Design an enzyme around this catalytic site. Structure first.
Site, PDB file in Angstrom:
ATOM      1  N   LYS A   1      13.843 -16.724 -26.026  1.00 23.91           N
ATOM      2  CA  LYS A   1      15.060 -17.464 -25.618  1.00 23.91           C
ATOM      3  C   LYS A   1      15.833 -16.578 -24.650  1.00 23.91           C
ATOM      4  O   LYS A   1      16.362 -15.528 -25.093  1.00 23.91           O
ATOM      5  CB  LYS A   1      15.911 -17.801 -26.834  1.00 23.91           C
ATOM      6  CG  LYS A   1      17.234 -18.490 -26.559  1.00 23.91           C
ATOM      7  CD  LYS A   1      18.194 -18.310 -27.742  1.00 23.91           C
ATOM      8  CE  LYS A   1      19.067 -19.496 -28.013  1.00 23.91           C
ATOM      9  NZ  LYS A   1      19.807 -19.319 -29.290  1.00 23.91           N
TER      10      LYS A   1
ATOM     11  N   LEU B   1       9.510 -24.617 -23.229  1.00 26.13           N
ATOM     12  CA  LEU B   1       9.700 -25.624 -24.293  1.00 26.13           C
ATOM     13  C   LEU B   1      10.852 -26.539 -23.854  1.00 26.13           C
ATOM     14  O   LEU B   1      11.807 -26.027 -23.247  1.00 26.13           O
ATOM     15  CB  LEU B   1       9.952 -24.885 -25.612  1.00 26.13           C
ATOM     16  CG  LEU B   1       8.807 -23.966 -26.036  1.00 26.13           C
ATOM     17  CD1 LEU B   1       9.131 -23.220 -27.321  1.00 26.13           C
ATOM     18  CD2 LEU B   1       7.520 -24.757 -26.197  1.00 26.13           C
ATOM     19  N   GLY B   2      10.695 -27.854 -24.030  1.00 20.85           N
ATOM     20  CA  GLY B   2      11.747 -28.851 -23.755  1.00 20.85           C
ATOM     21  C   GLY B   2      12.856 -28.740 -24.782  1.00 20.85           C
ATOM     22  O   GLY B   2      12.614 -29.105 -25.937  1.00 20.85           O
TER      23      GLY B   2
ATOM     24  N   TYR C   1      20.464 -27.626 -20.976  1.00 19.06           N
ATOM     25  CA  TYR C   1      21.339 -26.482 -21.351  1.00 19.06           C
ATOM     26  C   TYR C   1      20.631 -25.531 -22.322  1.00 19.06           C
ATOM     27  O   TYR C   1      21.239 -25.217 -23.364  1.00 19.06           O
ATOM     28  CB  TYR C   1      22.615 -26.981 -22.037  1.00 19.06           C
ATOM     29  CG  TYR C   1      23.595 -27.683 -21.134  1.00 19.06           C
ATOM     30  CD1 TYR C   1      24.488 -26.962 -20.359  1.00 19.06           C
ATOM     31  CD2 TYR C   1      23.636 -29.065 -21.063  1.00 19.06           C
ATOM     32  CE1 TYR C   1      25.395 -27.596 -19.530  1.00 19.06           C
ATOM     33  CE2 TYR C   1      24.537 -29.716 -20.238  1.00 19.06           C
ATOM     34  CZ  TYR C   1      25.418 -28.977 -19.468  1.00 19.06           C
ATOM     35  OH  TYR C   1      26.311 -29.592 -18.642  1.00 19.06           O
TER      36      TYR C   1
ATOM     37  N   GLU D   1      17.066 -22.356 -22.145  1.00 18.77           N
ATOM     38  CA  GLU D   1      15.849 -21.746 -21.542  1.00 18.77           C
ATOM     39  C   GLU D   1      15.024 -21.030 -22.621  1.00 18.77           C
ATOM     40  O   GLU D   1      15.238 -19.825 -22.848  1.00 18.77           O
ATOM     41  CB  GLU D   1      16.219 -20.775 -20.420  1.00 18.77           C
ATOM     42  CG  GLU D   1      16.396 -21.455 -19.076  1.00 18.77           C
ATOM     43  CD  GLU D   1      16.618 -20.479 -17.935  1.00 18.77           C
ATOM     44  OE1 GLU D   1      17.306 -19.456 -18.162  1.00 18.77           O
ATOM     45  OE2 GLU D   1      16.089 -20.732 -16.832  1.00 18.77           O
ATOM     46  N   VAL D   2      14.080 -21.762 -23.210  1.00 14.95           N
ATOM     47  CA  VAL D   2      13.215 -21.309 -24.324  1.00 14.95           C
ATOM     48  C   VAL D   2      11.749 -21.472 -23.911  1.00 14.95           C
ATOM     49  O   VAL D   2      11.359 -22.536 -23.379  1.00 14.95           O
ATOM     50  CB  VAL D   2      13.571 -22.075 -25.601  1.00 14.95           C
ATOM     51  CG1 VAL D   2      12.699 -21.641 -26.761  1.00 14.95           C
ATOM     52  CG2 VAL D   2      15.045 -21.919 -25.931  1.00 14.95           C
TER      53      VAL D   2
ATOM     54  N   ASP E   1      26.663 -25.434 -36.033  1.00 17.17           N
ATOM     55  CA  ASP E   1      25.953 -26.351 -35.089  1.00 17.17           C
ATOM     56  C   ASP E   1      24.754 -26.961 -35.809  1.00 17.17           C
ATOM     57  O   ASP E   1      23.639 -27.026 -35.228  1.00 17.17           O
ATOM     58  CB  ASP E   1      25.550 -25.587 -33.831  1.00 17.17           C
ATOM     59  CG  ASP E   1      25.219 -26.472 -32.632  1.00 17.17           C
ATOM     60  OD1 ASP E   1      25.659 -27.646 -32.621  1.00 17.17           O
ATOM     61  OD2 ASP E   1      24.478 -25.986 -31.759  1.00 17.17           O
TER      62      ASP E   1
END
Ligand SMILES: Brc1cccc2nn[nH]c12
Ligand SMILES: [Cl-]
Ligand SMILES: [Cl-]
Length: 333
Positions: free
Chosen positions: A67, A44-45, A49, A51-52, A155
Protein backbone atom coordinates in the site's frame (compact mmCIF):
# COMPACT_ATOMS: atom_id res chain seq x y z
CA UNK A 1 -22.76 25.74 28.49
CA UNK A 2 -20.71 23.08 26.58
CA UNK A 3 -21.51 19.46 25.59
CA UNK A 4 -21.77 16.93 28.50
CA UNK A 5 -18.59 14.79 28.74
CA UNK A 6 -18.61 11.05 27.89
CA UNK A 7 -16.37 8.03 28.67
CA UNK A 8 -16.18 4.57 27.06
CA UNK A 9 -18.10 1.92 29.14
CA UNK A 10 -15.22 -0.56 28.51
CA UNK A 11 -11.41 -0.36 28.08
CA UNK A 12 -11.67 3.28 29.33
CA UNK A 13 -8.17 3.60 30.83
CA UNK A 14 -6.17 0.95 28.93
CA UNK A 15 -3.84 3.52 27.19
CA UNK A 16 -3.22 5.45 30.48
CA UNK A 17 -1.82 2.19 32.04
CA UNK A 18 0.50 1.57 29.05
CA UNK A 19 3.96 3.09 28.63
CA UNK A 20 3.78 6.47 26.80
CA UNK A 21 5.52 4.85 23.75
CA UNK A 22 2.46 2.55 23.12
CA UNK A 23 0.09 5.42 22.13
CA UNK A 24 2.48 8.44 21.62
CA UNK A 25 2.72 7.74 17.87
CA UNK A 26 4.23 11.25 17.08
CA UNK A 27 7.44 10.13 18.94
CA UNK A 28 7.55 6.70 17.13
CA UNK A 29 10.83 6.20 15.16
CA UNK A 30 10.29 4.16 11.94
CA UNK A 31 13.13 2.07 10.47
CA UNK A 32 12.30 2.48 6.73
CA UNK A 33 13.18 -0.58 4.57
CA UNK A 34 13.94 -0.70 0.80
CA UNK A 35 10.90 -1.06 -1.57
CA UNK A 36 13.42 -2.86 -3.95
CA UNK A 37 13.02 -6.07 -1.80
CA UNK A 38 9.52 -6.19 -3.45
CA UNK A 39 8.44 -6.34 -7.15
CA UNK A 40 4.93 -5.05 -7.90
CA UNK A 41 2.85 -7.61 -9.88
CA UNK A 42 -0.47 -5.78 -10.49
CA UNK A 43 -2.70 -2.96 -9.17
CA UNK A 44 -5.64 -4.08 -6.97
CA UNK A 45 -8.97 -2.26 -7.65
CA UNK A 46 -9.53 -0.25 -4.41
CA UNK A 47 -11.28 2.86 -5.91
CA UNK A 48 -9.98 6.24 -7.25
CA UNK A 49 -8.62 7.12 -3.74
CA UNK A 50 -6.18 4.19 -3.00
CA UNK A 51 -2.89 2.73 -4.45
CA UNK A 52 -2.63 -0.98 -3.46
CA UNK A 53 -0.61 -3.61 -5.38
CA UNK A 54 -0.03 -7.33 -5.32
CA UNK A 55 3.73 -7.83 -5.06
CA UNK A 56 6.37 -10.54 -4.57
CA UNK A 57 9.06 -10.55 -1.85
CA UNK A 58 11.96 -11.45 -4.22
CA UNK A 59 14.08 -12.89 -1.29
CA UNK A 60 11.56 -15.70 -0.42
CA UNK A 61 9.21 -15.51 -3.51
CA UNK A 62 6.26 -14.85 -1.06
CA UNK A 63 3.13 -12.96 -2.24
CA UNK A 64 2.44 -9.69 -0.30
CA UNK A 65 0.21 -6.62 -0.67
CA UNK A 66 1.93 -3.18 -0.91
CA UNK A 67 0.00 0.00 0.00
CA UNK A 68 1.70 3.20 -1.27
CA UNK A 69 0.78 5.99 1.22
CA UNK A 70 -0.53 8.88 -0.96
CA UNK A 71 0.95 12.17 0.28
CA UNK A 72 -0.61 12.97 3.73
CA UNK A 73 0.66 14.37 7.11
CA UNK A 74 3.67 12.31 8.42
CA UNK A 75 1.67 12.20 11.73
CA UNK A 76 -1.10 10.13 10.01
CA UNK A 77 1.55 7.70 8.60
CA UNK A 78 3.17 7.21 12.08
CA UNK A 79 -0.33 6.72 13.58
CA UNK A 80 -1.27 3.91 11.12
CA UNK A 81 2.18 2.21 11.52
CA UNK A 82 2.05 2.36 15.36
CA UNK A 83 -1.56 0.99 15.41
CA UNK A 84 -0.67 -1.86 12.96
CA UNK A 85 2.47 -2.75 15.03
CA UNK A 86 0.41 -2.65 18.30
CA UNK A 87 -2.36 -4.88 16.81
CA UNK A 88 0.01 -7.27 14.93
CA UNK A 89 -1.01 -10.93 15.57
CA UNK A 90 -4.48 -9.99 16.88
CA UNK A 91 -7.43 -12.13 15.70
CA UNK A 92 -8.56 -11.24 12.13
CA UNK A 93 -6.24 -8.13 12.07
CA UNK A 94 -4.23 -7.65 8.79
CA UNK A 95 -0.49 -8.35 9.44
CA UNK A 96 2.01 -5.52 8.70
CA UNK A 97 5.11 -7.34 7.34
CA UNK A 98 7.40 -4.40 6.42
CA UNK A 99 7.61 -0.59 6.09
CA UNK A 100 9.55 0.64 3.04
CA UNK A 101 10.31 3.74 0.95
CA UNK A 102 10.90 3.85 -2.83
CA UNK A 103 14.68 4.65 -3.04
CA UNK A 104 14.00 7.34 -5.77
CA UNK A 105 10.55 8.95 -5.01
CA UNK A 106 11.08 8.36 -1.20
CA UNK A 107 7.27 7.68 -1.09
CA UNK A 108 6.44 5.57 2.02
CA UNK A 109 4.64 2.19 1.59
CA UNK A 110 3.26 -0.50 3.93
CA UNK A 111 3.79 -4.20 3.08
CA UNK A 112 1.10 -6.62 4.34
CA UNK A 113 0.54 -10.38 4.50
CA UNK A 114 -1.14 -11.47 1.23
CA UNK A 115 -4.96 -11.42 1.15
CA UNK A 116 -7.09 -11.97 -1.99
CA UNK A 117 -8.64 -8.63 -3.16
CA UNK A 118 -12.13 -10.10 -2.33
CA UNK A 119 -13.81 -7.54 0.02
CA UNK A 120 -17.02 -8.37 1.97
CA UNK A 121 -19.05 -5.93 -0.26
CA UNK A 122 -18.63 -8.41 -3.22
CA UNK A 123 -20.05 -11.34 -1.16
CA UNK A 124 -22.24 -9.90 1.68
CA UNK A 125 -25.50 -9.59 -0.41
CA UNK A 126 -25.44 -13.40 -1.31
CA UNK A 127 -24.68 -15.08 2.12
CA UNK A 128 -26.81 -17.67 4.03
CA UNK A 129 -28.23 -16.72 7.46
CA UNK A 130 -25.45 -18.90 9.07
CA UNK A 131 -22.64 -17.18 7.06
CA UNK A 132 -23.87 -13.67 8.05
CA UNK A 133 -23.69 -14.80 11.74
CA UNK A 134 -20.28 -16.48 11.15
CA UNK A 135 -18.59 -13.46 9.48
CA UNK A 136 -20.24 -10.95 11.90
CA UNK A 137 -18.69 -12.98 14.80
CA UNK A 138 -15.23 -12.92 13.02
CA UNK A 139 -15.51 -9.09 12.63
CA UNK A 140 -16.45 -8.80 16.34
CA UNK A 141 -13.28 -10.76 17.33
CA UNK A 142 -11.19 -8.04 15.52
CA UNK A 143 -13.17 -5.16 17.09
CA UNK A 144 -13.12 -6.58 20.64
CA UNK A 145 -9.33 -7.07 20.18
CA UNK A 146 -8.54 -3.54 18.84
CA UNK A 147 -10.92 -1.96 21.47
CA UNK A 148 -9.20 -4.00 24.29
CA UNK A 149 -5.87 -2.63 22.87
CA UNK A 150 -7.13 0.98 23.25
CA UNK A 151 -7.86 1.50 19.50
CA UNK A 152 -11.01 2.44 17.56
CA UNK A 153 -11.05 1.62 13.79
CA UNK A 154 -13.46 4.47 12.78
CA UNK A 155 -13.90 3.17 9.16
CA UNK A 156 -15.75 -0.15 9.62
CA UNK A 157 -17.54 -0.89 6.30
CA UNK A 158 -17.75 -3.88 3.89
CA UNK A 159 -14.92 -2.51 1.64
CA UNK A 160 -12.55 -2.70 4.71
CA UNK A 161 -13.32 -6.41 5.41
CA UNK A 162 -11.30 -8.90 3.28
CA UNK A 163 -12.87 -12.41 3.11
CA UNK A 164 -11.44 -15.67 1.77
CA UNK A 165 -14.86 -17.43 1.52
CA UNK A 166 -13.27 -20.81 0.48
CA UNK A 167 -11.18 -20.93 3.76
CA UNK A 168 -13.81 -18.95 5.81
CA UNK A 169 -11.06 -16.43 6.80
CA UNK A 170 -11.58 -12.68 7.37
CA UNK A 171 -9.27 -9.69 7.93
CA UNK A 172 -10.16 -6.14 9.00
CA UNK A 173 -8.01 -3.79 6.87
CA UNK A 174 -7.34 -0.04 6.28
CA UNK A 175 -6.28 1.25 9.71
CA UNK A 176 -5.49 4.70 8.18
CA UNK A 177 -8.42 6.36 10.10
CA UNK A 178 -7.88 4.35 13.36
CA UNK A 179 -7.11 6.32 16.58
CA UNK A 180 -6.13 5.62 20.21
CA UNK A 181 -8.97 6.08 22.71
CA UNK A 182 -8.11 8.53 25.54
CA UNK A 183 -10.80 9.45 28.09
CA UNK A 184 -11.92 13.09 27.57
CA UNK A 185 -10.20 13.43 24.12
CA UNK A 186 -12.32 15.32 21.52
CA UNK A 187 -11.90 13.60 18.11
CA UNK A 188 -12.34 14.70 14.48
CA UNK A 189 -15.94 13.88 13.43
CA UNK A 190 -14.88 13.89 9.71
CA UNK A 191 -14.19 10.13 9.68
CA UNK A 192 -15.97 7.07 8.20
CA UNK A 193 -17.93 6.86 4.92
CA UNK A 194 -21.35 8.66 4.83
CA UNK A 195 -23.59 5.56 5.08
CA UNK A 196 -21.66 4.17 8.14
CA UNK A 197 -21.33 7.49 10.11
CA UNK A 198 -22.68 7.23 13.68
CA UNK A 199 -25.10 9.94 14.91
CA UNK A 200 -22.22 11.31 17.12
CA UNK A 201 -20.35 12.21 13.88
CA UNK A 202 -23.48 13.73 12.22
CA UNK A 203 -24.42 16.02 15.18
CA UNK A 204 -20.73 16.92 15.83
CA UNK A 205 -20.30 15.18 19.25
CA UNK A 206 -16.47 14.87 19.47
CA UNK A 207 -16.06 12.92 22.77
CA UNK A 208 -16.85 9.54 21.11
CA UNK A 209 -15.27 6.10 21.68
CA UNK A 210 -15.12 2.44 20.53
CA UNK A 211 -18.99 2.46 20.34
CA UNK A 212 -18.64 4.34 16.98
CA UNK A 213 -17.43 1.05 15.40
CA UNK A 214 -20.53 -0.71 16.83
CA UNK A 215 -22.87 1.71 14.95
CA UNK A 216 -20.93 1.01 11.69
CA UNK A 217 -21.25 -2.72 12.37
CA UNK A 218 -25.03 -2.34 12.86
CA UNK A 219 -25.27 -0.54 9.48
CA UNK A 220 -23.46 -3.51 7.84
CA UNK A 221 -25.70 -6.08 9.63
CA UNK A 222 -28.89 -4.20 8.56
CA UNK A 223 -27.64 -4.05 4.90
CA UNK A 224 -27.00 -7.85 4.93
CA UNK A 225 -30.15 -9.27 6.66
CA UNK A 226 -32.50 -6.81 4.79
CA UNK A 227 -30.53 -6.94 1.44
CA UNK A 228 -30.66 -3.08 1.38
CA UNK A 229 -27.34 -1.49 0.37
CA UNK A 230 -26.86 0.92 2.02
CA UNK A 231 -29.40 0.67 4.85
CA UNK A 232 -29.30 4.46 5.63
CA UNK A 233 -29.06 6.05 2.15
CA UNK A 234 -28.39 9.80 2.71
CA UNK A 235 -27.83 12.35 -0.13
CA UNK A 236 -25.20 14.03 2.10
CA UNK A 237 -24.15 14.23 5.79
CA UNK A 238 -27.32 16.25 6.77
CA UNK A 239 -29.75 13.95 4.92
CA UNK A 240 -27.85 10.96 6.47
CA UNK A 241 -29.26 11.86 9.94
CA UNK A 242 -32.78 12.33 8.44
CA UNK A 243 -32.56 8.77 6.96
CA UNK A 244 -31.63 7.49 10.44
CA UNK A 245 -34.40 9.59 12.15
CA UNK A 246 -37.03 8.09 9.76
CA UNK A 247 -36.14 4.59 11.18
CA UNK A 248 -34.98 5.20 14.81
CA UNK A 249 -37.53 8.05 15.31
CA UNK A 250 -37.06 11.69 16.40
CA UNK A 251 -38.05 11.21 20.12
CA UNK A 252 -34.90 9.15 20.96
CA UNK A 253 -32.83 11.61 18.79
CA UNK A 254 -33.96 14.75 20.69
CA UNK A 255 -33.53 12.87 24.04
CA UNK A 256 -29.91 12.01 22.99
CA UNK A 257 -29.26 15.69 22.00
CA UNK A 258 -30.76 16.87 25.37
CA UNK A 259 -28.78 14.25 27.43
CA UNK A 260 -25.33 15.36 26.03
CA UNK A 261 -26.39 19.06 25.74
CA UNK A 262 -25.49 18.91 21.97
CA UNK A 263 -25.85 22.21 19.98
CA UNK A 264 -27.65 20.92 16.83
CA UNK A 265 -26.48 22.67 13.59
CA UNK A 266 -29.36 25.04 12.58
CA UNK A 267 -29.71 23.36 9.09
CA UNK A 268 -31.22 20.33 10.94
CA UNK A 269 -34.19 22.41 12.26
CA UNK A 270 -36.18 22.18 8.96
CA UNK A 271 -35.29 18.69 7.67
CA UNK A 272 -35.47 16.25 10.69
CA UNK A 273 -39.25 16.82 11.17
CA UNK A 274 -41.06 14.30 13.44
CA UNK A 275 -40.93 10.48 12.97
CA UNK A 276 -42.10 7.41 14.91
CA UNK A 277 -39.55 4.69 15.71
CA UNK A 278 -40.33 2.02 13.05
CA UNK A 279 -40.72 -1.71 13.78
CA UNK A 280 -38.01 -3.74 11.91
CA UNK A 281 -40.82 -5.94 10.36
CA UNK A 282 -41.34 -2.91 7.98
CA UNK A 283 -38.02 -3.86 6.16
CA UNK A 284 -38.86 -7.64 5.85
CA UNK A 285 -40.09 -8.97 2.45
CA UNK A 286 -40.10 -12.30 0.48
CA UNK A 287 -36.43 -11.92 -0.78
CA UNK A 288 -34.84 -11.26 2.69
CA UNK A 289 -37.19 -13.10 5.18
CA UNK A 290 -34.80 -16.17 5.23
CA UNK A 291 -32.05 -13.89 6.78
CA UNK A 292 -34.34 -12.21 9.36
CA UNK A 293 -35.09 -13.84 12.76
CA UNK A 294 -36.22 -12.50 16.16
CA UNK A 295 -32.54 -13.09 17.27
CA UNK A 296 -31.17 -10.96 14.33
CA UNK A 297 -33.65 -8.07 14.99
CA UNK A 298 -33.02 -8.08 18.78
CA UNK A 299 -29.24 -7.92 18.08
CA UNK A 300 -29.55 -5.17 15.38
CA UNK A 301 -31.79 -3.05 17.63
CA UNK A 302 -29.06 -3.11 20.38
CA UNK A 303 -26.34 -1.84 17.91
CA UNK A 304 -28.36 0.96 16.24
CA UNK A 305 -28.89 3.44 19.15
CA UNK A 306 -28.39 7.22 19.01
CA UNK A 307 -26.81 7.12 22.49
CA UNK A 308 -23.31 5.64 21.95
CA UNK A 309 -23.23 4.56 25.65
CA UNK A 310 -26.40 2.39 25.11
CA UNK A 311 -24.90 0.33 22.20
CA UNK A 312 -23.58 -3.20 22.83
CA UNK A 313 -19.81 -3.43 23.32
CA UNK A 314 -18.06 -5.89 20.95
CA UNK A 315 -17.83 -8.49 23.78
CA UNK A 316 -21.55 -8.06 24.79
CA UNK A 317 -22.45 -8.44 21.05
CA UNK A 318 -20.42 -11.72 20.90
CA UNK A 319 -22.56 -13.02 23.86
CA UNK A 320 -25.93 -12.29 22.06
CA UNK A 321 -28.24 -15.29 21.26
CA UNK A 322 -27.80 -14.46 17.52
CA UNK A 323 -24.30 -16.16 17.78
CA UNK A 324 -25.19 -19.25 19.96
CA UNK A 325 -24.87 -21.74 17.01
CA UNK A 326 -21.60 -20.05 15.78
CA UNK A 327 -20.11 -20.29 19.35
CA UNK A 328 -21.22 -24.00 19.67
CA UNK A 329 -19.78 -24.93 16.19
CA UNK A 330 -16.46 -23.19 17.11
CA UNK A 331 -16.11 -25.14 20.44
CA UNK A 332 -16.41 -28.43 18.40
CA UNK A 333 -13.83 -26.94 15.88
BR1 LIG B 1 -6.43 -3.47 0.14
C1 LIG B 1 -5.43 -3.74 1.70
C2 LIG B 1 -4.88 -4.99 1.93
C3 LIG B 1 -4.16 -5.21 3.08
C4 LIG B 1 -4.04 -4.19 4.01
C5 LIG B 1 -4.61 -2.93 3.79
N1 LIG B 1 -4.67 -1.77 4.55
N2 LIG B 1 -5.33 -0.87 3.82
N3 LIG B 1 -5.76 -1.41 2.63
C6 LIG B 1 -5.31 -2.71 2.61
CL1 LIG C 1 -18.26 -0.26 1.75
CL1 LIG D 1 -8.24 12.12 12.57
Amino acid sequence: SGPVPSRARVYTDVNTHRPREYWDYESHVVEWGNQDDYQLVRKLGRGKYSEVFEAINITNNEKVVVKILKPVKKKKIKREIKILENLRGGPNIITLADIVKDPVSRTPALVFEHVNNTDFKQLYQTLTDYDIRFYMYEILKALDYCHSMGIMHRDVKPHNVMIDHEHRKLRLIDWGLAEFYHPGQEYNVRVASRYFKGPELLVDYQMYDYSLDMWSLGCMLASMIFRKEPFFHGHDNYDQLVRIAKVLGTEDLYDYIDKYNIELDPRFNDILGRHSRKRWERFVHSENQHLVSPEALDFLDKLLRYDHQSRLTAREAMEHPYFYTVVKDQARM
